[model samples]
Target: IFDIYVVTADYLPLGAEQDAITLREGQYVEVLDAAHPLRWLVRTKPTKSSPSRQGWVSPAYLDRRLKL
Candidate 1:
């Protein structure tokens, strides 16, 4: 089953490597991988400015709660 997570903080790509991605608070995403201890892979939903992207992000910046 796929797990959905919500962004709890804003994060910007650190560099070209690491495949890092941008995350905005309250955004919903699908968790793709968690093999990394501190970072996890997630696929984002398409937005007005960009299409869906998959990349690494800090797990601490995400939350599982779908409601307030």
Candidate 2:
């Protein structure tokens, strides 16, 4: 079974603290995919300027099983 999860931030929290962090364009970040139980996805921040743009980490990336 394939499940799709959507994560978003309103950028209203204190200091912009949310599931994702704000990063400049061309910035690189490490992400993880927890749906697979063990996987990593490294992606660059999008260049599009938007109020909702933020870098997020997948469950897999934060999992102890995976390391940068």
Candidate 3:
């Protein structure tokens, strides 16, 4: 229950037609699924009252082994 995240990129340096989530730095998520290593579906942890919400994240932000 401690898959806490460690965000590095404030914004995607590479331009895009769309943008990723505006989640604050140092949030936690539970990996949901993955097709490619670079992308993952996860639910942010420790929601106020409801459960965590899901979103996509770059593998670069994930510290799987670290599990910090």
Candidate 4:
């Protein structure tokens, strides 16, 4: 089951992993997987600038809220 979360900090993906995503503070994402202790797989909420994208991110930087 996917869950929604707000990004608390900006995260720029490293050149090392294409599977990682860039996250801007104040943006929302749909968490696809959170079983990993350090990283969680998430999909970005599509907006005018870009389409929905999927990648792995640090769960520590995410703020979980009610699934609206």
Best by TM-score: 4
Colliding residue pairs in candidate 2: 32-61, 34-60
Instruction: Tell me the TM-score of each prediction against the true structure.
Output: 0.70, 0.25, 0.57, 0.72
Q: 1-47, model 2: which lDDT tens digit per residue?
A: 22322333222224655454533323333443333443333343345
**Model 1 over residues 1-68: C-alpha lDDT tens digits?**
56778866676666665667767777888788788788877887677888788988788877775433
Off by over 4 Å in 4: 14-16
Q: Pick the winner on lDDT between candidates 2 and 3.
A: 3
10 residues in a row with least lDDT, candidate 2:
2-11
> RMSD of model 3, in Å?
3.9
Pairs in clash, predicted candidate 4: none
Number of backbone clashes in candidate 3: 0
TM-score (C-alpha, index-matched) for candidate 1? 0.70
- Tell me the tens digit of each residue's lDDT in model 3 across 1-68: 43545665443445553435545556556666665777766666665697656667776866653452
TM-score of 2: 0.25
lDDT of each: 0.75, 0.36, 0.59, 0.77
User: 1-68, model 4: which lDDT tens digit per residue?
Assistant: 56788877777766777667777888877877766888877787787887788888888877777664
Clashes of 4: 0
* Residue 6 alpha-carbon offset, candidate 3, angstroms: 2.8
For candidate 3, the TM-score is 0.57
